[PDB]
Amino acid sequence: TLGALEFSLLYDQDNSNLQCTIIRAKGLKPMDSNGLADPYVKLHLLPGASKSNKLRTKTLRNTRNPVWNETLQYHGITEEDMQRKTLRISVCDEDKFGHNEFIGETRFSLKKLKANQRKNFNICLERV
Ligand SMILES: [Ca+2]
Numbered sequence: 035t036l037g038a039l040e041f042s043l044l045y046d047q048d049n050s051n052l053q054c055t056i057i058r059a060k061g062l063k064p065m066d067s068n069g070l071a072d073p074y075v076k077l078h079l080l081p082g083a084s085k086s087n088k089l090r091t092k093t094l095r096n097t098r099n100p101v102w103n104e105t106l107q108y109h110g111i112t113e114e115d116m117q118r119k120t121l122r123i124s125v126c127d128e129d130k131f132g133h134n135e136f137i138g139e140t141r142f143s144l145k146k147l148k149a150n151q152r153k154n155f156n157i158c159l160e161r162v
Pocket of ligand 1 (some may be wrong): 068
C-alpha cells in the first residue's frame with residue numbers, strides 16, 4: 035500500500051545505452067503531515083562510484099498519481115555492466131523547503147534484461 039511504479043527499460047546494446055522511461059505512479063502513500071505531495075523518481079546504478087550513476091526526473095506538484103513520462107538515459111553501459119550492476123529506483127516526495135522524503139523503492143537486476151528487447155514494468159514499491 036505504498037503505491038506502484040510503472041516504467042519501461044531498453045538496452046540499446048549497439049550504442050552502449052540503457053534507456054529508462056519513468057511513466058507514472060499510482061496511489062503513492064502520503065507520509066509526513068508537514069510533507070508535500072511533490073514526488074520525483076531517483077535512479078541509482080549499483081554497485082557504482084556515484085554522481086554519474088545517479089539520475090533524477092522532474093518534480094510534479096500536489097499529486098498522489100504522478101505521470102512523469104520522461105526518459106532518462108545511462109550512456110557508457112556495456113554488457114559487462116549489464117552483467118554486473120543493478121538498477122535501484124526510488125520515489126521521493128520533496129517538501130516546503132528542499133528536503134526529500136523517501137516513500138518507496140524497487141531494484142531491477144540488469145542481468146535479467148535481454149538486449150534490444152524492451153521490457154515494461156509495473157511493480158509495487160517497498161522499504162528495504
Ligand atoms: Ca517530510
